Chains A and B, each alone.
Chain A
Amino acid sequence: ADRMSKWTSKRGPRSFRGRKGRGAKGIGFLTSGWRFVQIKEMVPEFVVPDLTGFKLKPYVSYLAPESEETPLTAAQLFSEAVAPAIEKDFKDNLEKYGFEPTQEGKLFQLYPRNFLR
């Protein structure tokens, strides 16, 4: 009778409560006998770096100078990453400079994005 409260897994009968989840991403599948097979590759692996010797800190000293925000753009990145090599080879086949015709074949495809965060 409650139309306004959100529908969750706490509400329906046993079947409803079992079937609905809370948004947690799937980790494996269900075989015969409702035995859950967890796929290792489906489990997010946290790639945590080694922080030993790291100098950066959660906060920055107020003594740092103010600066003007300059959001990175495709043009700026191209100028700062490809333009030097292009000039040096033009004065003297774009894959040599970095461009890849297609994202297929890469582990981290830029579109459709296939990596987390």
Chain B
Amino acid sequence: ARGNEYQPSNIKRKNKHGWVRRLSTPAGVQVILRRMLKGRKSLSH
């Protein structure tokens, strides 16, 4: 019954975790800054 909580949709993916939304708020900008400091290859989703 459970396990399939991920129902992929690129629109939701980008609107929820994308670069633009991350930069839309100071908290998201700090998310990006933390990923950059850690050296993540993928800063945003």
Q: Which A positions have Cβ atoms within 8 angstroms of B?
A: 1, 3-4, 11-13, 16
> C-beta contact mask, B8-29 vs A, less than 8 Å → 1, else 0?
1111001000000000000000
Given contact pairs A3-B42, A4-B41, A4-B42, A12 touches B11 in the complex (Cβ within 8 A): yes
Q: Is the interface of B mostly helix, strand, loop or mixed?
A: loop
Closest to B45 in A: A3
Q: Which B positions have Cβ atoms within 8 angstroms of A?
A: 6, 8-11, 14, 41-42, 45
- Residues in A with CB closer than 8 Å to B9 are 13
- Residues in B with CB closer than 8 Å to A1 are 6, 8
Question: In the assembled complex, how far is the CB of residue A40 from the closest CB belonging to chain B, in whole angstroms?
Answer: 36
